[PDB]
Symmetry: D2
Subunit: 220 residues, 4 copies
């Protein structure tokens, strides 16, 4: 495993071990995302958590992922389905895919993630074979056809979109597919500074990273 202080093994650090001093730590997935090599957005832990919760991902399921880097969203999905549920992650741009496979593979040593280079709409997949579809695309409405195709009825597709304008365009686009609009939310984590006697919500905030969109696949 990798260590946070971010390094990949020098030996005082291992002898101290996590929670020990030389301040050595074993990274949380969160810490790891926030310090890993990025070309990405990056997908934030608060958003990826809520996405796994809307997708209703449980162990053993199949989850379809697109697109971009860098394995941030893919790892959260990877733990959610784990064991051998399956993550089929699609990325279009090849050095971003590369970087992501590296990112994921160094933290997560299980092999429940199948990686695919190429747009999701080019790909061929079974009808009604997937337990959820997670998208982190700037133009998600493109894959809507495939997504309704590959997605078991009464399951969700969950898009991640920064701009509300993109969210509206999905919601209209989604009206021409067997998808019923289930949720539109903004996730927010309100950090507090506690350095007693100082105790206030932090002065500078992550005032949202993105909107999460959730469509449910009704039968059609």
């Amino acid at each position: 495993g990798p260590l946070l202080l971010l390094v990949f093994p020098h030996e005082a650090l291992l002898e101290a071990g996590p929670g020990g001093v030389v301040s050595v730590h074993r990274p949380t997935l969160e810490e790891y995302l926030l310090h890993m090599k990025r070309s990405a957005t990056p997908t934030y832990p608060k958003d990826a958590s809520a996405m796994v919760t809307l997708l209703d991902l449980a162990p053993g399921m199949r989850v379809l992922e697109a697109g971009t880097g860098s394995g941030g969203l893919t790892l959260f999905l990877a733990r959610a389905v784990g064991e051998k549920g399956l993550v089929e992650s699609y990325e279009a741009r090849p050095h971003h895919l590369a970087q992501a496979e590296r990112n994921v593979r160094a933290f997560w040593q299980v092999e429940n993630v199948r990686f695919h280079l190429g747009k999701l709409e080019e790909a061929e997949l079974e009808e009604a074979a997937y337990d959820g579809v997670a998208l982190a695309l700037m133009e998600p409405w493109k894959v809507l056809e495939k997504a309704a195709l590959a997605l078991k009825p009464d399951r969700f597709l969950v898009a991640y979109l920064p701009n509300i304008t993109q969210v509206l365009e999905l919601v209209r686009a989604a009206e021409a597919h067997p998808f019923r609009l289930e949720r539109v939310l903004e996730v927010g984590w309100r950090e507090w500074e506690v350095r007693l006697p100082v105790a206030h919500p932090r002065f500078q905030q992550v005032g949202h990273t993105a909107f999460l969109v959730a469509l449910r696949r009704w039968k059609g």
Copy 2:
């Protein structure tokens, strides 16, 4: 498992989302909202295989999340003090989730005993979480987290001060917010009515330690 109509649970037809389940199951009493339970799992840094300590009340709402999170290789030990509705936690959890990764107990922790450094994370929903730090701390592998659910900032403060006595560094205090939007074009706005504040989440991290 059970079914959901649009919107009541029973035994438009839907398999219920775990979150839908928590929101329409017999929630004893002031529920664990999924907004929070999801958060806590994230903070606790849970993966498949791990062992997690949970207390207490009282719908086993948090518990299901814990169950899915750690998986089948992992297991959850759930304590709950209260007797009649620890059962109700058990009724709620076995309806939705039929895996052997949860082992229940009656009682508070301090009365209980447990291996030292066995557990990969602790999750508290107790009114007075400061009572269980000697044990929580003992039970916890170093560098892993204790995550505690608390309605009032006064309780958060007390847990922060009581924790200075044990080998815990405070990493985080946060409120979660899932602001739902309504979108029926041309209408598009944040929902008028919202699950505002449910609780603070204190995350503590075990030192080596000493």
Copy 3:
């Protein structure tokens, strides 16, 4: 002046002292006299006899308890709009809105008795509401009501220090509002749906405004009854987007 009454449960009521009225909060009447003799600050019993606190209502307190039959405007947002408008006393402000009367009332205070608020309502019911609601709380002359729309209003040119709107389709008045507004003074619009905000911004690029702010006021009430101290569980999450625009220098 009207009166706000509260019980120990916290529940508040609005009362208008009327000749020999009586207030019923349960199966127990209170004569209006006791309310008036008690005065802002004191208690009254319902002859059964439940303590009840008498208050003069704060402008805010009045807006939330009046019966509100227009699609209406909150104090958190009205407050913010007065401030975005940069409203100082003596100023002249053009207004168009709902029948709430709230927005007109918040603007009325900002400008003072030496200032002015020309308030326009389109529907004649919607006008009566605003007058009813506005002159119960404030009878000063710095508010003048008009029936109609701004695009059809006859306005002096560059005579106004700000424009406050609470219309469902404000792109429509941007043209009149442009000539009516002094350079570097603002238009501020109360829009519930982000779509309306989006259309207005798109529209505004055709008139001599620069967009300046787009925002959402939140007032997070806390409950404190020690040892209970937290953010109120249920709150007024979202009401409206405020859009602030600036009239370009010179034109």
Copy 4:
């Protein structure tokens, strides 16, 4: 290009942490200030809550601003009387606890003080009944200190609230709440004065 009060407050000379208009707007609304009223103000920063308060009270109203420490009082006065012509403000070089003021003759008390509890008693006197004291406090721990201390004066706690303005960046086709917000400045505490006691 002439400037709005906000803009002035930004290029103004502010020794302390500034006042944000969200907070000052909310402060005026919570005190229920209308044209004509007589309001009491202290003290840190200087002089931007006072400008808001002058606009609120109006033409015929008056704001009594206390600044314990002089060079600040002066800087308050230059700042205020550069932007705000009206002679509707009265500056005092004194603490607010030490000063001597007619009973039940004020329509509010606006404190930006670190030590708000300290002036609790002289406010209960000065402030008419069923009117308000509103305190700006950054920390929840100070809020709590004040909540305990006011239990010992003729005050009911009406309101504790944090004020947020969620800015949006609209730059079509961009449209999204701004990534970096001013997440929190402070809490507002409103106390109501009881009858006689």
